[PDB]
């Protein structure tokens, strides 16, 4: 869960955005981003194949219908 | 006022109490077999060529019957 750090005692910061990076995220902001990330989220081809088999049977019924004339 | 920690090569983020690692492994093994995003392109071109040749069968059955 929570991290495990090398240096024991914390250090204050004074830097700028143009200097070194730092994670400074307020809690409701990260909560809302977790909500927004959570909320933002074949055999029919075999069905087509089997229906095409039925079309093949319909077609051979048509072939048996046509040759009798 | 702000308090932080200076980065190191010996600071380690642990596993998230193995209650989220298990759903990571679930998401690992529920997608080992599925959409490979490779035959989707083959699916598109096969569907399109199939539509093309079926419409060609329509033209053949419309003209060769006369």
């Amino acid at each position: 869960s929570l991290l495990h750090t090398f240096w024991r005692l914390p250090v204050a910061v004074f830097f700028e955005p143009h200097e070194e990076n730092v994670l400074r995220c307020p809690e409701r902001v990260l909560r809302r981003l977790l909500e927004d990330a959570a909320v933002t989220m074949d055999r029919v081809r075999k069905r087509y194949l089997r229906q095409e088999l039925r079309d093949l049977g319909h077609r051979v019924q048509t072939y048996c219908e046509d040759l009798e004339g | 006022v702000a308090v932080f920690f200076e980065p190191h090569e010996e600071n380690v983020l642990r596993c998230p109490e193995r209650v989220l690692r298990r759903l990571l492994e679930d998401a690992a093994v529920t997608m080992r077999g599925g959409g490979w995003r490779e035959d989707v392109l083959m699916d598109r071109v096969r569907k399109r060529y199939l539509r093309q040749e079926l419409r060609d069968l329509g033209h053949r059955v419309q003209t060769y019957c006369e």
Binding site: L49, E52, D66, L67 | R46, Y49, E53
Partner: peptide, 20 residues
């Protein structure tokens, strides 16, 4: 003609089977 039409349809369905 008629047998030619029936044969070309069943053979073209047999080659339709080799897309899927």
């Amino acid at each position: 003609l008629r047998q030619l039409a029936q044969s070309v349809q069943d053979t073209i369905q047999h080659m339709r089977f080799l897309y899927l």
